[PDB]
């Protein structure tokens, strides 16, 4: 059994066939999956030839957008000592990350770049959808706008002594008009004060009510002076048809945070086309867990 | 519990005296034993009684069929389930529970199957607990001078003990004194006729002697006296019934099969998974991970609906079976019958009927022939001579039995008749086709009798003639017809009388042989009318002197008789013949009877011969002609007693027509053994307690249901609760049909296995988006594609079963290389393919093109990255690219079930095509409409998403897996087209199952 | 179209299940009329 089933050397077999019999079997099998391999390709290929290259044919499960932050946090909590620096440098590295790709030094001439208001404005439209016209042009964003958090003056940007920022992004949709909410009767209480019509308001409060009292100052940087996002910057074309684009940025200082002990803020973007989600804990608003124990 | 000293043949004190007898057990031959003394050896060595059988509790059984091949694996599943939960709990956060939902799914799995299948054996010992009737039974024991009738369980040895016709011997006894005393040895020593006891020894054999009266057997007439010699278990039946209950049970053919399957499955699960565990230390992944990953993989090689769908495939041949009145108290015993290859039958109770029937008769120089068979189907005898009439008169009034009272219910031939075997016969057959006996008798009064002589050896008496115009005397005897002919010197022809010239003689003479070679007993019915003249109506003609002509009567004709075959006996042993399977009698009744019936029945074809048979038609002595010119041999008991092994597998291997005859239980048992030593199946069907140790060690054993013993019905496996010979041939054909049918349900079980587990090996190797879920899994081995598996039971034969040779256990298998060639190679590949191919376009048409997925698993899973960017540069949330998963993982299984369609189709018909054999089984139409309604209800139905995770679909992305489908069904049609054209091809030794 | 384009992002998955289950509603019933065609 064990030893004749593997050699025999009276009908010449090995395993159980001869020499001939493995060829017959492999060659089968190779025009067989061969065959299956041409079949799969072309089923692809006219898969390939059924999509657009400038436009993705659903958009139903990215229509309210999300909103993201720079820090990376593992359980959306940021705790670091303000003496051991070995402490918030994973937090540093990642705002850095984000930050280095807003290097003017990027951003320079006439293409693809062009100069935009300095102040919050209106939507700008470059056309279609198509390439017609050649790569259109993005509105260039400056570092400087956002003043306390740059990297550019205190390179940790605030880690160092108890103030930590963050660095607010919405999610870039192709064809997505932010819409801001109307000077109506109805509008939060936060939101009546300072109504640019251009711009998206992000405005940040506590989770507990009990907690009001232990955050401090939220002080917001962003074009303008303005605590949101210029309308200017939409819409996004998309990677193909604006590649080197750049999407606004809002800062947080969270001035005045007591000391050891674990804060819950909640961060909210407000706009008709902005809905949020019980389930998804990053549509249109986002939670971070700050504990500056020193 | 020596078994050797069991097996062993019986030994015995029998060649003694009564003197000797009474000297050694200590009896008074007139007296008995003293009620003080008989009480001293009842407490001293134990009841009358056999002991009961080894009880169970319900709770053993239970645990029974919890465990066994299949489920054991499917507990090592689960097993491993939970142990790769409890590591990923100790290594990571936020540990996926889905390892512990399938442990707890296939435990569910297990368990479920064995409250099943127990529920069904139980059932069945229901049924089977509603036979065993047992009445109380006292018998007559004489002590200190009296006759006293006390309970069974209180007779011991040495007291005296009487018995008369009607009542049953209560323990082996010593006859003392007898009175014409007959016993019925059928159950124990298979003797279809009432051997005599006598008080003299006769054989150095125990069960050929009459001085010894056995157990459990019944004094048909007379009356006796004996010592109780044996007693209690120690008695023969009670070392047969012990033996039999110490014997081992074995391992069927479909368990075997189910474990060399269990085998292949775990060879290459076990290879899949120490190969990619390689593979993956090779790609740098952690040691933590690759073991989650082989346990992942080999546990994803497990088919747990498998195990649902063969106990209810086993299941439904079982009910058709109980339709027939077949019952079955295992569940595999079922398939035994089709793979049987050699048939070793008894023939008293089993192959024949064990009642006497009146079968030839002889009358106007012309053997006639009646029916004698249980239903009385046949062919009359031609009723319309006057000679036929007279004979009825003859046997209808020189007969004393008579019909018990109460019987004008049942048939004519099952009513119980008190009075001798003969006298019954010839009473059933007059009643039969003569009308009601009881007015025949009264219509002619019997005037005087002179009973049966040992020397006169005929019976004879004379009563009025009811003719109104004759009032002379009839006379009527019967008796042997060579003493009777003797007796006479006139012939009854077509109703006027001629002499007894020699030419009739002769006639007579070889019509006696020709009766008597036929393995029947003849007598001879003869009758005179007494002149008016010389003996008037009021001489009384006492039975002293000679008042009647002893010579000088009226021979009218013989009456042979003997005990018929059951209906479907002959036809049924000439389909298990035809079907290539082996018949061979064993029986312990006389050789001269045995291979009459074998021919009868088909056992020895006719024109074939024996050596003797041989040696007779030459006229030359037996030890010249060779053995080899004789195809069938009578192989006696006497003769095996003294034979080797290798003597009796040359006798087996020579000889086609077996007909072994005065053979013991232990003898059986050797038999069958000898059958099993080479290498096939044995059915050892039977009906009395000699063949319990033949039916138990047989590999599957048929036990008669009205006319068997508790024993032997205890120790079978299957019941034939209406004592039909056809249900053999009904179950060798039903076992052949649920082989092919199981083979075909494998195969299609099987084929899904593919696509269930290349997505998981793409995801490790390829790092892309997990295609395939858990819950998914689950809901498609255990959901779906049970209807469909199960309704492959339905399908009909495609060429007739009852003609190709059975299969060879050591080389055609249930699962071999040729099945999973196309279930893990050809068919499954194509369905993987097909539910990749869903895949990627539901990924393409949200924005996810095939060249970016290749490398995203690390940032696609992460639960802290809210902006993965896709081939059009949007940013996806974690939930949203998630909830993108889980609407393929949604697809990906209905193309499942699509690529299942054709694979059900294909999996119909093994080799025949599919606008041949035809979709007349309305199951699998069911199967595929609930199959595909299923689906849509899992997607569809509000609150899935967040119960299961199972989102709705498009109406462009169900068609994606139609292309893939059409074409396993086109590879499969030309597939089974090959194979018939070319016999014998490459296609049919590669893809042939 | 232009800035109230609200509708290239909206999607009646209801009507959509309605209709799939009506349809497998359909076929469970299909299903087990030949099922019991021919026991009456
Ligand atoms: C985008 O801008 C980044 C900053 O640009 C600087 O500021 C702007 C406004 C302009 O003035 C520009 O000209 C400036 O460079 C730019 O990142 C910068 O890249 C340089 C070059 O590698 C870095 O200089 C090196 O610094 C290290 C030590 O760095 C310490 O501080 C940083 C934080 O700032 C920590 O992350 C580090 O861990 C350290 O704690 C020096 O050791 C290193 O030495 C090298 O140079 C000296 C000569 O000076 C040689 O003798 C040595 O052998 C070495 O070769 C450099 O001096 C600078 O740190 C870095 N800035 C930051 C904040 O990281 C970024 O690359 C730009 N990206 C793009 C895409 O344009
Ligand atoms: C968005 O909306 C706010 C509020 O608009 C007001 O409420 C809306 C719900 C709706 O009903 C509007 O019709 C309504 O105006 C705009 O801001 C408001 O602007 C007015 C005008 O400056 C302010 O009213 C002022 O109230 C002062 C005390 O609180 C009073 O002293 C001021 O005096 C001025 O007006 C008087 C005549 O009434 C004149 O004599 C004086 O010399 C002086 O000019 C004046 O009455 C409101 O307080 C403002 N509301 C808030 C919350 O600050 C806002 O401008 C608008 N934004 C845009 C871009 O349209
Ligand atoms: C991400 C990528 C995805 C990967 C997915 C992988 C999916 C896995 C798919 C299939 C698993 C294949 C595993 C092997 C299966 C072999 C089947 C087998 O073992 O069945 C058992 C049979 C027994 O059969 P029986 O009972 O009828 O025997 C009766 C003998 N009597 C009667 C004479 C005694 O035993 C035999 O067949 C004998 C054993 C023969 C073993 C052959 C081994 C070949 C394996 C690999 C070859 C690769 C070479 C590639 C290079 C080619 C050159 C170019
Ligand atoms: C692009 C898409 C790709 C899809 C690929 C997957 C396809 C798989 C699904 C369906 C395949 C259908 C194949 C059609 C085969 C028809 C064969 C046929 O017609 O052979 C004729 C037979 C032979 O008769 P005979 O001569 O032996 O009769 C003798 C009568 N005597 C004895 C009285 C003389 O006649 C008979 O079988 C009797 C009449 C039976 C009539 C059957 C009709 C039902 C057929 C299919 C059911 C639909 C399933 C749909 C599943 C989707 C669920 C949503
Ligand atoms: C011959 C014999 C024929 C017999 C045929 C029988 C067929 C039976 C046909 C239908 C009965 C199916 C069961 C009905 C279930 C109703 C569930 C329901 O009406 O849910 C409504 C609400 C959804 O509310 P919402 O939209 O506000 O939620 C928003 C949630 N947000 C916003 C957080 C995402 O539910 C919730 O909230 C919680 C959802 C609870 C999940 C229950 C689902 C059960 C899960 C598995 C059982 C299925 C096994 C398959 C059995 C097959 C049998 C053939
Ligand atoms: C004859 C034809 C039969 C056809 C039937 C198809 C057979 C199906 C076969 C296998 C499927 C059973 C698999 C059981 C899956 C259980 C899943 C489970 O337990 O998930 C746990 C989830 C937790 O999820 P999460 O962590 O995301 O929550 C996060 C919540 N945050 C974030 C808001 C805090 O809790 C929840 O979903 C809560 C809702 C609980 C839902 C239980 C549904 C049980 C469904 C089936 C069991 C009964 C089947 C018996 C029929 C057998 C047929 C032979
Ligand atoms: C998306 C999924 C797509 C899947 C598509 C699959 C298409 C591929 C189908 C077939 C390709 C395999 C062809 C292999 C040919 C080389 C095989 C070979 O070397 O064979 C040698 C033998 C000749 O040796 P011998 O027997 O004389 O020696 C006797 C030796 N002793 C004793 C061992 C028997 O060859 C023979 O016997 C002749 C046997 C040739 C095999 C015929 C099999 C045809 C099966 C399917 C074709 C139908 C495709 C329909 C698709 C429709 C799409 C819409
Ligand atoms: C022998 C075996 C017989 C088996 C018979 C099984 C019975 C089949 C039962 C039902 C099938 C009919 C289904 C009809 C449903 C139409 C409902 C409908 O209104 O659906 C519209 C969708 C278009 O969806 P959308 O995404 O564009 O808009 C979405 C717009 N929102 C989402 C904004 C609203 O369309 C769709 O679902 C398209 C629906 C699929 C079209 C049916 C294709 C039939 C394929 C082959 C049959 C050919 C037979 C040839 C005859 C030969 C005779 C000898
Ligand atoms: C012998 C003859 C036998 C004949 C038997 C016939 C049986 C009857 C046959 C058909 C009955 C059809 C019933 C139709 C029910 C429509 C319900 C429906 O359209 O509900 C849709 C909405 C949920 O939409 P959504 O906005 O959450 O979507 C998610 C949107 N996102 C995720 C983007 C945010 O419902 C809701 O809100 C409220 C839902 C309330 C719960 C309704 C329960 C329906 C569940 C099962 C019934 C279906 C059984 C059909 C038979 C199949 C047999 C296998
Ligand atoms: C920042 O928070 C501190 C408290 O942590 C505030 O200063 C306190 O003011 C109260 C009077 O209301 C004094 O009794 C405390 O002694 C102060 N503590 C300190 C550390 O100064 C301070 O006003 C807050 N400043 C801002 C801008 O929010
Ligand atoms: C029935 C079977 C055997 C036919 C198999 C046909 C195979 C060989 C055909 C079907 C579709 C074909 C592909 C169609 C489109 C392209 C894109 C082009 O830029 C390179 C060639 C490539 C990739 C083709 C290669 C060959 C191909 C895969
Ligand atoms: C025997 C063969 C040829 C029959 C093939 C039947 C196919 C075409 C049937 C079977 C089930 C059907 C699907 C059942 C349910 C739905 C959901 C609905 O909202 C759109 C149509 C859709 C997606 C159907 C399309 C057609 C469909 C896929
Ligand atoms: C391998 C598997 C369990 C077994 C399985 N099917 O088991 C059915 C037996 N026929 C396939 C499952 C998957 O593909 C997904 C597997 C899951 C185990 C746990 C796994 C490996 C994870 O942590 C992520 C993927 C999960
Ligand atoms: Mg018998
Ligand atoms: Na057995």
């Given at each position: ?17 001869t ?14 999956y061969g ?12 898969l ?53 790709l ?76 932010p ?10 209480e ?29 002080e ?15 819409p996004?074309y ?23 002990m674990?804060?819950?803020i909640?961060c ?5 086309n ?7 804990r ?10 500056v124990?020193? | ?15 003694l ?10 009896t ?25 059988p ?7 059984k ?6 066994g ?10 097993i ?5 939960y ?38 069945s ?15 007559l ?11 069974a369980?209180?007779?011991?040895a ?16 010593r006859?003392?004194?007898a ?8 159950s ?9 006891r ?6 150095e ?21 004996g010592?109780?010699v ?5 008695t ?5 019934a ?11 053919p ?14 290459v699960?076990?290879?899949?998974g ?12 952690s ?28 299941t439904?041949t ?15 015993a ?7 290859s ?31 068979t ?16 007279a004979?009825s ?15 004008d ?15 019954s016969?010839?009473?059933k057959?007059?009643e039969?086709?003569?009308?009601s ?25 004379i009563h ?11 006379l ?24 007894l010239?020699?030419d ?29 003249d010389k ?25 042979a008789?003997?005990?018929?075959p ?10 298990c ?16 009877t045995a ?50 092994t ?11 027509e ?9 003898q ?8 099993q ?25 048929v036990?008669?249901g009205?006319?068997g013993?508790?024993?032997?019905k205890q120790?079978?496996?299957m019941?034939?609760?209406?004592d ?21 349900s494998i195969?299609?079980?099987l ?15 390829g ?10 899994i ?5 959901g779906?594609?049970?209807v ?22 050591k080389t055609?298998?249930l699962?071999?290389?040729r ?30 093109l095939?060249?970016?997925?290749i490398?995203?698993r ?33 697809s ?18 093994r ?16 199967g ?8 849509a ?20 992305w ?5 292309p893939?489908?059409?074409?396993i ?25 | ?8 992002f ?5 009507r ?18 030949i ?6």
């Open positions: 059994g064990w030893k004749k089933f593997l050699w025999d050397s009276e009908k010449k077999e090995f395993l159980g066939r020499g001939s019999s493995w060829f017959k079997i492999f060659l089968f099998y190779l025009i067989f065959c299956l391999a041409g079949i799969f390709i072309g089923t692809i290929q006219v390939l030839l059924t999509l657009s290259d400038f436009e993705p044919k659903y958009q139903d499960r990215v229509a309210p957008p999300g909103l993201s932050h720079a820090p990376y946090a593992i359980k959306t909590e940021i705790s670091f000592s303000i003496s051991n620096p070995k402490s918030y440098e994973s937090f540093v590295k990642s705002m850095h990350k984000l930050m280095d807003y290097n003017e030094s990027s951003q320079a001439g006439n293409s693809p770049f062009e100069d935009c208001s300095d102040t919050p404005a209106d939507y700008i439209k470059r056309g279609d959808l198509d390439d017609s016209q050649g790569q259109k042009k993005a509105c260039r964003f400056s570092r400087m706008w956002l003043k306390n958090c740059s990297g550019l003056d205190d390179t940790t940007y605030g880690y160092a002594e108890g103030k930590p920022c963050v660095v607010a992004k919405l999610n870039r949709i192709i064809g997505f008009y819409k801001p909410l109307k000077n109506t009767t109805d509008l939060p936060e939101l009546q004060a300072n109504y640019n019509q251009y711009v998206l308001p992000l405005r940040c409060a506590a989770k507990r009510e009990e907690d009001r009292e232990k955050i401090g100052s939220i917001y940087f962003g074009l303008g002076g303005y605590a949101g996002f210029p309308l200017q910057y939409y996004y998309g990677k193909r048809l604006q590649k080197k684009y750049l999407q606004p940025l809002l800062a947080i200082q969270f001035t005045n945070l007591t000391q050891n674990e804060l819950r909640e909210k973007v407000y706009g008709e902005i809905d949020y989600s019980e389930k998804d990053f549509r249109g608003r986002f939670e971070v867990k700050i504990e124990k020193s | 519990d020596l078994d050797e000293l069991k097996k062993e043949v019986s030994m015995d004190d029998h060649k005296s009564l003197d000797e007898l009474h000297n050694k057990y200590g008074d031959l007139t007296r008995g034993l003293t009620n003080a003394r008989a009480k001293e050896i009842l407490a001293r060595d134990g009841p009358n009684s056999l002991t009961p080894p009880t169970t509790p319900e709770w053993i239970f645990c029974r069929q919890l465990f091949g299949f489920s054991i694996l499917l507990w090592i599943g689960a491993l389930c939970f142990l790769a409890g590591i990923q709990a100790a290594t990571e956060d936020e540990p996926a529970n889905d390892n512990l939902y399938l442990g707890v799914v296939l435990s569910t799995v297990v368990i479920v199957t064995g409250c099943f299948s127990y529920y069904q054996e139980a059932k010992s229901r049924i089977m607990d509603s036979f065993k009737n047992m009445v109380p039974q006292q018998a024991v004489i002590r200190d001078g009296e006759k006293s009738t006390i309970n369980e209180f007779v011991v040495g007291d005296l003990v009487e018995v008369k016709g009607g009542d049953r011997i209560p323990a082996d006894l006859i003392i004194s009175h014409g005393c007959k016993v019925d040895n059928s124990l020593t298979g003797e279809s006729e009432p051997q005599t006598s008080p003299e020894f006769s054989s054999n125990p069960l050929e002697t009459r001085n010894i009266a056995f157990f459990s057997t019944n004094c048909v007439e007379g009356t006796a006296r010592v109780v044996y007693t209690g278990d120690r023969v039946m009670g070392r047969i012990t033996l039999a209950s110490g014997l081992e049970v074995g391992r069927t479909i368990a075997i099969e189910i474990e060399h399957f269990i085998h292949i499955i775990t060879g699960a076990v290879f899949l120490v190969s990619f565990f390689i593979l993956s230390l090779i790609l740098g992944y040691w933590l991970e690759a073991v989650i990953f082989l346990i992942g993989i080999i546990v994803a090689n497990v088919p747990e609906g498998l195990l649902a769908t063969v106990t209810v495939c086993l439904l079982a009910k058709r079976m109980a339709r027939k009145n077949c019952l079955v108290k295992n569940l595999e079922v398939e035994t019958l089709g793979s049987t050699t048939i070793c039958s008894d023939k008293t109770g089993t192959l024949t009927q064990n009642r006497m029937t009146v079968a030839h008769m002889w009358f106007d120089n012309q053997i006639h022939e009646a029916d004698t249980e239903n009385q189907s046949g062919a009359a005898f031609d009723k319309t001579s006057a000679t036929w009439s004979l008169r003859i046997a209808a009034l020189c007969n004393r039995a008579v019909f018990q009272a109460g019987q219910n049942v048939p004519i031939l099952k009513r119980s008749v008190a009075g001798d075997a003969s006298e016969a010839l009473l057959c007059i039969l086709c003569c009308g006996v009881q007015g025949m008798r009264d219509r002619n009064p019997k005037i005087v009798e002179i009973p049966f002589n040992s020397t006169n050896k005929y019976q004879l008496s009025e003639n009811e003719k109104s115009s004759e009032s002379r005397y009839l009527v005897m019967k008796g042997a017809p060579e003493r009777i002919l003797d007796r006479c010197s006139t012939i009854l022809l077509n109703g006027a009388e001629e002499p010239k020699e009739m003689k002769e006639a007579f003479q070889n019509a006696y042989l020709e009766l008597g070679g036929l393995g029947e007993r003849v007598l001879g019915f003869c009758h005179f009318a007494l002149p008016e003996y008037n109506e009021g001489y009384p003609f006492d039975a002293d002197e000679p008042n009647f002509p002893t010579t000088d009567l009226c021979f009218v004709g013989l009456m008789m003997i005990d018929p059951r209906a479907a006996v002959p036809d049924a042993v000439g389909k013949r035809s079907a290539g399977i082996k018949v061979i009698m064993v029986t312990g009744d006389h050789p001269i291979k009459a019936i074998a021919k009868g029945v088909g056992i020895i074809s006719e024109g074939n011969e024996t050596i003797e048979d041989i040696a007779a038609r030459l006229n030359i002595p037996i030890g010249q002609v060779n053995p080899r010119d004789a195809k069938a041999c009578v192989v006696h008991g006497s003769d095996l007693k003294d034979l080797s290798e003597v009796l597998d040359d006798i087996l291997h020579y000889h086609t077996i007909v072994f005859a005065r053979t013991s239980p232990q059986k048992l050797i038999i069958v053994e000898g059958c030593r080479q290498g096939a199946i044995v059915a050892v069907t039977g009906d009395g307690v000699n063949d319990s140790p033949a039916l138990k060690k047989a590999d599957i054993g036990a008669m009205i006319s013993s508790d024993v032997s120790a079978a496996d019941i034939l609760l209406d039909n010979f056809a249900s053999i041939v009904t179950g060798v054909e039903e076992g052949r049909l649920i082989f092919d049918n199981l083979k075909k195969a299609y079980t084929t899904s296995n593919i696509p269930e587990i290349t997505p998981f090996l793409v995801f490790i190797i790092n892309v988006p997990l295609p395939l879920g858990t819950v998914t689950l809901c498609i081995d255990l779906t594609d049970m469909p598996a199960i309704s492959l039971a339905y399908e009909q034969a495609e060429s007739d079963i009852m003609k190709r040779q059975p299969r060879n256990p055609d298998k699962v071999n290389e099945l999973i060639s196309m279930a893990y190679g050809q068919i499954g590949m194509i369905q993987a393919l097909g539910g990749f191919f869903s895949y990627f376009v539901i990924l393409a048409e949200n924005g996810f095939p060249m970016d997925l490398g995203k690390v940032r696609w899973d992460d639960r802290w990255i809210s902006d993965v960017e896709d081939s059009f540069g949007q940013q996806w949330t974690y939930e949203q690219r998630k909830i993108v998963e889980f609407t393929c993982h949604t990906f299984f209905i193309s499942i079930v699509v690529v299942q369609w054709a694979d059900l189709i294909i999996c119909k018909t080799r025949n095509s599919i606008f041949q054999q035809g979709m007349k089984n309305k199951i699998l139409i069911f595929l409409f609930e199959e595909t309604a299923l689906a209800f899992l997607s569809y139905c509000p609150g899935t998403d967040v119960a299961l995770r199972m989102y709705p679909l498009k109406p462009s169900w068609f994606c897996a139609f893939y489908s059409l074409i069904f086109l590879y499969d049609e030309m597939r089974r087209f090959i194979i018939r054209r070319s016999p014998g091809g490459w296609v049919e030794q590669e893809t042939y199952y | 179209e232009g800035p109230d384009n609200d509708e290239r909206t999607y009646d998955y209801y959509l299940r309605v209709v799939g289950l009506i349809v497998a509603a359909v076929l469970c019933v299909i299903g087990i009329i099922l019991l065609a021919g026991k009456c």
